[PDB]
Amino acid sequence: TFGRCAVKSNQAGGGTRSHDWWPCQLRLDVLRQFQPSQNPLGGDFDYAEAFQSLDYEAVKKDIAALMTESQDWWPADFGNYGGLFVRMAWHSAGTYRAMDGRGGGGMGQQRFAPLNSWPDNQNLDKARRLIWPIKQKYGNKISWADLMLLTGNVALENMGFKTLGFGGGRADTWQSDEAVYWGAETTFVPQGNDVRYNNSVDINARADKLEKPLAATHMGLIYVNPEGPNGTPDPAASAKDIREAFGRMGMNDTETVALIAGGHAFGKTHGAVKGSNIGPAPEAADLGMQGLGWHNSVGDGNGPNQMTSGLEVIWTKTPTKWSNGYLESLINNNWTLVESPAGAHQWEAVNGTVDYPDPFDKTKFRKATMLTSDLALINDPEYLKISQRWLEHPEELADAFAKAWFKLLHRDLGPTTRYLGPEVPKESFIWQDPLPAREGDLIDDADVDKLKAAILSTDGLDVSKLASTAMACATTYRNSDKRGGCNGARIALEPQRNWVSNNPTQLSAVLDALKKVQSDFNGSNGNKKVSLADLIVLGGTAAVEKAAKDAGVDIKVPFSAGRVDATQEQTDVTQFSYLEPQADGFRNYGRGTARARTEEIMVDKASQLTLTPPELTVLVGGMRALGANYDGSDVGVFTANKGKLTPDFFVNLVDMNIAWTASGADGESWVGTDRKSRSEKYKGSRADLVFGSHAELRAIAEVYAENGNQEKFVKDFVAAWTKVMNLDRFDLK
Amino acid sequence: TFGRCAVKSNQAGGGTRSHDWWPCQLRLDVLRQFQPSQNPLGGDFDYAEAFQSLDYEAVKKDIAALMTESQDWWPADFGNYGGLFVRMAWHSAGTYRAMDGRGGGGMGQQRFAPLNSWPDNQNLDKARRLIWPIKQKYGNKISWADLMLLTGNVALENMGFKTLGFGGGRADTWQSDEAVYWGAETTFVPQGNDVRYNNSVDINARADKLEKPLAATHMGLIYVNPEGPNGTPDPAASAKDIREAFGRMGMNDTETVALIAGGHAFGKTHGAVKGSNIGPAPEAADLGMQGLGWHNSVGDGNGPNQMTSGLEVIWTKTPTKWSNGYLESLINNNWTLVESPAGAHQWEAVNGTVDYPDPFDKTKFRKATMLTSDLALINDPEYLKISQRWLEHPEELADAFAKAWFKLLHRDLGPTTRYLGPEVPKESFIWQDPLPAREGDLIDDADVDKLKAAILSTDGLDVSKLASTAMACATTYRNSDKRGGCNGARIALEPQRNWVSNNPTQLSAVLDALKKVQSDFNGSNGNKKVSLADLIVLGGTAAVEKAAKDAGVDIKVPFSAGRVDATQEQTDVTQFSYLEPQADGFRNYGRGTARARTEEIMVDKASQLTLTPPELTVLVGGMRALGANYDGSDVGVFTANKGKLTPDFFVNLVDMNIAWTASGADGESWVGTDRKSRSEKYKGSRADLVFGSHAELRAIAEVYAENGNQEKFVKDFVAAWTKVMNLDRFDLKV
Ligand SMILES: [O-]
Ligand SMILES: [O-]
Incomplete structure (x- = not known):
């Protein structure tokens, strides 16, 4: 039900x-x-x-x-x-x-x-x-x-x-x-957290074991429960939840106290009547409510009768004006646990001043109040020190x-x-993943032509390595927060340069080579200067163009110059650790987890790159034809012409003369055996084989495997490549 | 679970x-x-x-x-x-x-x-x-x-x-x-049918009570259960299921017997081993199966060990060649109930000739066999008659x-x-909803302009009626089977001219007026002749253009000529009765039921018109501005400028000075009251109010309610109108 x-x-x-x-x-x-x-x-x-x-x-x-x-x-x-x-x-x-x-x-x-x-x-x-x-x-x-x-x-x-x-x-x-x-819970707060705490109700012990990548202690909350962990009015335990949840939101102790104390300088909470008077939330409400919800049946349901959280707390004596009243109240009052009119746990200064204003009656006043989650800030050693400092x-x-x-x-x-x-x-600010202004004058099409030719004839570079390196740099992009991508050449910086998924020893050789091309150009073209970022992308782009030519398709592969190189100072290692992939289908890297299959991770990444199903599909098939695996292996490389941009990956995947069977106990490795000769012909991953299994993906694989669609394959691959390379190019009009 | x-x-x-x-x-x-x-x-x-x-x-x-x-x-x-x-x-x-x-x-x-x-x-x-x-x-x-x-x-x-x-x-x-x-069942055959029979298990009595619009007797079947209803090997009751299911697929008794006897001239069924040997269906199978499923673990799982339906029946002595062996066997053998190797009910002629070929051994043979669903054809009076006739x-x-x-x-x-x-x-063929060849030369741009002017100056035609009539004709289109639409002018024929949703008294007058325009043009313009179908669409199109102009916007409203007029003989009442709407959101007709709310019917219809959410939204809002309700009511017509193409519907819908409350018991009618003056200002339906309730539809309503988006509203309406009017224009080159 x-x-x-x-x-x-x-x-x-x-x-x-x-x-x-x-x-x-x-x-x-x-x-x-x-x-x-x-x-x-x-x-x-x-x-x-x-x-x-x-x-x-x-x-x-x-x-x-x-x-x-x-x-x-x-x-x-x-x-x-x-x-x-x-x-x-x-x-x-x-x-x-x-x-x-x-x-x-x-x-x-x-x-x-x-x-x-x-x-x-x-x-x-x-x-x-x-x-x-x-x-x-x-x-x-x-x-x-x-x-x-x-x-x-x-x-x-x-x-x-x-x-x-x-x-x-x-x-x-x-x-x-x-x-x-x-989250995976089937209830909201006050429930909504059995899964994210793996059924633990030990509020102190479990606090730092919140399920990744979640950042709230119950389904349906922003961060934490204002009445304490699982509604237990224990401020010390609440502090542990606060540190955990805000930390998952990228905020440290000083940012956390600043946000809470700053925010609760203003306004008030609402808990005037009990929850049974409240109607359905907006998605469950009737047409007459016209997009609103939580209709309150008491009086007109508003003003003095407002019911939102079930708490009735006014933090400061001037709720419409900035003050230090939050911390002054928090530290100077003695607090007693009381019930709000709606029956929720909150704290009151019962022997304090009666000078907190009523929101609708200027003659009426109340005593100081706080939430359990407010008291957290003086019931944790580190928060207490910050609160004390800022009080003064x-x-x-x-x-x-x-x-x-x-x-x-x-x-x-x-x-x-x-x-x-x-x-x-x-x-x-460091969290903006900042980029410098450009060096010198922008390269033009003549410079690009010269650079492509140099890159494709430089020691340590080839089509496979260039395509792989460009895609590795590109797929750090995620549309949800618009972080990542090729601008900045952050693959050349920590932590990306030492990610196992980037094959660091191969990567250093590739980057040294591109740096040599850069040094040759930047020392000899007047005020024109080229970035490593542009060379990474241009190298992969030139590789794709040549591979297309080798496959019998002459196509101009677009390139948009103007990327700049980030400094390491602008590239916080902890911030960028969050972009490290568990698996990458484009370069046949990695394995899934107990909660997510390899192919699910790939679809999730594709969504973050804004790809459609055809775009995802064409890119995988092309990367395999190019021999662009992260380790240079032949897994998924179903072609006798590695480095030529053919649809062989698809042709061979759907060849019914090949029988596919599990090799690894872990579900991640597969072997393709010629049914006639009985000899092993191929090795495949889940990222490879999903394209021949899922009915909608296989429908696309078939298109590229069809006679006559070799040029279409190239055109579609080039379009998708261009799109992915340019995802972060917000600098371009 | x-x-x-x-x-x-x-x-x-x-x-x-x-x-x-x-x-x-x-x-x-x-x-x-x-x-x-x-x-x-x-x-x-x-x-x-x-x-x-x-x-x-x-x-x-x-x-x-x-x-x-x-x-x-x-x-x-x-x-x-x-x-x-x-x-x-x-x-x-x-x-x-x-x-x-x-x-x-x-x-x-x-x-x-x-x-x-x-x-x-x-x-x-x-x-x-x-x-x-x-x-x-x-x-x-x-x-x-x-x-x-x-x-x-x-x-x-x-x-x-x-x-x-x-x-x-x-x-x-x-x-x-x-x-x-x-269907709504949460199981497949052999289950998968409690909902569609409303929990009835009386197989003969229930057979003609299959839940509409369904056309199979269990979820996961094409039509009927080859072992008989609910796997009960009764041929007479099987026959009643067959009639019901094939009838729901648009096939009569003659067609049904022809297809079954025609199909089962060929091949065989497969039921060599128990179902326990069969692995997951394709959507549940592992990656190595590469899109296939039902892997059979006995031998190689194929050839002699094939297991598909659980039945092991070979109908004729020559399964790779057309013959009349099916009806001969059916009528001239006596049948006994037996079990297939997989344990399923089937029929065998146990006294019969042992000359039905084995599929993988040219020297081995078997007795004649039939499915329960095959025996249905001689255990129903009407089927038996057709069967006997075709034996001869x-x-x-x-x-x-x-x-x-x-x-x-x-x-x-x-x-x-x-x-x-x-x-x-x-x-x-009638089921192709045929159209005649055109009569006369095709009207050109100048002719179209002259006809728009004539239409708009004709007594009894106004913007509201012209827009309403064109949309009523267009929304019969459904993309699933590519039936319906404006081509043919079938709104002028039975049954559509009598649909209560078309306001037949009004429609008759509108069509008479358009027929006058037609008469005046045809014979006075050389070889050029215009169809009633084109006049219905051109009328609505002229109305939209006029309505835009009256709202201060000069916009081209495209028109594609060349529709023809169907005859009644080309227009089957049964087939067309299936296109009759129970509710229509574009013209504020009717209502939904428990299992299909008014607004759900609207979205379903929108899907059949290939509309996006913005296209659905703009069309409803524009129809309301035009006063294009089927009966000319003011329900949803939230404008002081009815007949002018404006976004007033959206502007007024989201005006927070209006409070909306239910008027009836069934939640279909709503009143909009001015909160300050306390007076009733508007009446609304569920088709109206859903656009201010659903978060994604409301987001679109807001776009068209925004100051500065008036011209955009007109442009989007005209684009959507054009799309809908042209859905059935397969005759025009893309
Ligand atoms: O808050
Ligand atoms: O069948």
Whole structure:
């Protein structure tokens, strides 16, 4: 019954489906998302151009104005929506996970399932509805993704906290991103965590054993449970969860305290009535609710009766104005465990001052309150030291919060060249994976011709090695947070240069050779200078062009110059460790895990490269024809003409005279035996054989194996190659 | 456990998904299938042009050669793959359901999940693999879809049965079609039918009560259970299932007997070993099986050990040659209930001649055998009569089978204009929804302009009625079997002219007016003559152009002339009754039911029109702005400028000063109240309000509600309108 509707529809996809019958079969769904035809703006819409015509200052003025314009259907606390909007922006950005690069605010996914209906996003449907008139006014020139985050940024500034600035540039998306692994639990918070803790309920011991790559302690939360681990009001244990979850989001102790203390300077929580008065979340609500949810049946369901988290906490005596009241209260008050009106665990200063304002009655006041997760910051040795320091030096908190908030909002925006608008901060931050300005003058087509010829006749280089090295550098790209790719030549830097998947001894030889080509050019062409990054890509691109020529297809393989070389200082080894692949199908590297088969990892990577199923397929077949395995092995190299760009991989894979059988106990190695001669002809991996097994992939393999499609194979390969090589080229108009 | 993998992947979409949390929510998946980017051949690939250059006669010669080239990994019965190939083609075409027009061979879906792994398609994985070398040889110039069916047709002809011919033209598809309702059961045959019989197990009584629109008696079967209903070997009850299932596939008694007796002239069934020796179906098999499944562990798992259905029946004494041996055996033997080697029910003539050949030993023979489903044909009064007649007059069987086989293979290919190749049958058949040749010279641009002006100045025609009538005509199109659309002007004929969803009183007046425009033009413009079909579409098109102009936008609204007018004799009432909508979101007609909500019907219809979510959304919004409801109501007409092409529907739908509340008990009617003034402002349906509720549809509604997107709205509406009006224009070169 979980995951099943009581009524079984017989239209619009209703009925038992293929994935119901064979739920373990590989699915290509993630390669069919975000298709141009599904984008109502058109596949060629240029968001950056639209945003640059925007009257940016006017937009912020209108956002600031709205914050104190209370709407009767959801009245503003203290006459100011600032706190609500800060929470909106924080939750949009706060799903980010540094290791796999998923979540974050960069696609505006809060407006779709499942995030629109996660328990932790309760009543943010109201927040999004409040800013819709600004979206309506400025139309396509500001995206929902940008607007949600800008609104929080403007809210901070119009409550007295000056930020570092802001960058736009997040293009909207148009369907739910069903590629994200949020977890395998079949419940939400307050449950939703048996799997991610492997059934452990030892809250201290389990804290640092949260399932990778997850960054929240329950399904449906942003980071942690405000009532403590599994609702246990133990601040010390909560601190361990906080460190774990924020750490998984790429934040350290100082950033973590800064974000929590900075954030909870503002607004309040809502727990005025018990949960049984609350209707279905937006995805489960009736048509009349028109995209909203959590309808509250008590009174008008809003204002004094607001119910969001079940807690009723006001952190400071001025919830609409920046202060040091959070840390002053946290440290100077004595705290007692009490119940909120909705029955949740929170803390109160029962003998403290009665001067915390009521959000709808200026004559009424309350005592100081805190969450268990707030008390965490003084019930951990390291957090306590930071809290103590900043109590005395609030300007240090302000500095750290400005920096951490900027990071939170922009971590997944990608390279600096993507950041739009007139107040992009000038400081270059390590988490932006920064790139320098170019050296010298840009190479032209004559220089490219000369360089191709040199590269293809240089000691230590050949077609196989060049193609492999270029693809290895390219596939670090991931579209979720726009990290990685060939720009920067980071394969030449730590940690990539010593990744086992890069065959470091071969790689050093390849890079030394390309550096020699670079030195020869840069010492002798006036002010023209070429980057190693461009040479890596140009080398692989020249290799592909020659391989095509050798296969009997004359094609001009495009090349876009202008990449620059990152420094090691700009390339944090821990940050880049997150891009290291477990397996890579393009170069026949690696093995799957207990939770993910080799071919599943390949489809996941393909989705991160924005590839369609035909693009994935053509690239694998071509890489095999080129002999481009990471180790130079013959696994999957089903051709007698290694280095020629033929569709032999496909032709031989589907040759029924070859019988395929398991060799390794682990399911990863396969042998292809000629059924006539009974001799072993080939060795294959799961990345190879999936193309002859999965019915949709095999349909594509057949196309390339068909007589007459040799030129088509080359044209398609070259298109896909170009696309992959240029994924990070946001510097190009 | 059902529908859940034991290992929970954390890659490639692994993890709990939105549809798991909210499984009753409307899904737009069916509007995101078959997108050009997913097609390895490219969006601009023209299969018709590729097929035109095909060496068709050479393909048939190669298929014929293959039939007797036995491959050691799947040895041919009697040294001839003919029977297997006929079954392959029959199963490819045999999933068709007349009521919704889904299934059939026209998309080549047998090669994808779920059809590649249905129990009834066991070992057709081998059949498809056998023909791959021909596909490899001819490349893009013949589709898998055409090849599977052509192979069956060529197999018949080489085994001595001359067919009527064949038409190509089925472009391949590239992903599983997850829009088809094959049933709600969570099991396959031998189970897979509790839902479709509403838990009835009375096999004779329930036979005519099969859940609509289904056309098989268990999930995973083509039509019926060869062992009898629920595996009960009763031929009389089997006959009632056969009538029901084939009737649901658009075949009558004569056609049914012809196909069954015609098909079972050839080959044999396979039931040599117990099912326990058979491994996973293709979608569940390991990588080494390379797309095949049902691996049989006895011996080499093939030849004498073949196990497909569990039955071991050879119908005739010459299974590789056309004969009347099937009806002779059926009627002239006495039958006793026996068990096959796999333990399944079948029938044998235990006193009969021992002269039915063994498939791998030319010296060994067996007695005659039949399936329970074969005995059905002499255990029903009507079938028995046809059977006895054709025993005596096998030439009548031959004629009926040629016609029924041609129909089976081509029923979902659409208009005759789509049929390709050198042996397209010359006879025009009713199930092809035939159209006449055009009358007169084709109207030109100047004529079109003159006709638009005449239409718009004709009493009784206005923008709302013209747009409504054109869309009512167009949305009969369904891409699954390529039926319906504006060509033919069938809205003027029975049954469409009487559809309550077409507002027959109003429609009659609109058509009379268009007929006046036609009369005035035809005979006053030399040899140029215009059809009523073109006038209906041109009228709507003129209306849209006028509505745009009245909204301040001068836009070309393209028009493609050349439609013809069908006759009533070319327009079958039964066939066309299957296109009658129960709800229509474009014109705010009708409603859904428990199992198909109003908005679900709309999305299903959109899928059949090949619409994307933005295209569906823009069309609904524009129809409302035009006041184009079927009955001229104001339901959903959220505009003070009805008849002007504006995005008002969206603007007003998302206006937070309007509060929406249910008016009726069934959740189909909604009232929109101005929160300040407290007055009722609007009435809305579920088709209206879903665009402000569903998060993905609302995201699109917002685009068209945004200040600055007015011109974009008009451009997108006109593009979508043009698309829908032209869906059936296979006569025009792409
Ligand atoms: O929060
Ligand atoms: O069959």
